[PDB]
Amino acid sequence: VVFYVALTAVLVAVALYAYGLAFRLLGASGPNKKESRGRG
Questions:
Q1: What does residue 32 show for φ and ψ, rounded to 5 degrees?
Q2: For this UniProt entry, which segments traverse the membrane (predicted)?
Q3: Closest by Cα among 10, 33, 11, 9 to 21
Q4: Are 24 and 36 in contact (CB under 8 A)?
Q5: Cα dist from 27 to 4, 10, 12, 19, whole Å
Q6: Of 9, 30, 3, which is closest to residue 18 (Cα–Cα)?
Q7: CA pair distance 13, 31, nearest whole angstrom
Q8: Rg (CA), the chain
Q9: Angle at 21 (CA atoms; ends 40, 30), nearest 5 degrees
Q10: Are the CB atoms for 20 and 31 separated by under 8 Å?
Q11: How far is 35 from 40, CA to CA, in rounded Å?
C-alpha cells in the first residue's frame, strides 16, 4: 500500500468516476447517474 498518493494526483482520483458507473451503489455526495457500455 501507498495510500493511493499517485492515483489521487497523476490519475486525478479517476477510480471515483469508474465506481460512479461500474457500481453506482450510492449518490448522496458523489457520481451515480451512468452505467457501463461496450462495442463487442
A1: -155, 10
A2: 1-27
A3: 33
A4: no
A5: 23, 25, 20, 11
A6: 30
A7: 13
A8: 12
A9: 165
A10: yes
A11: 16
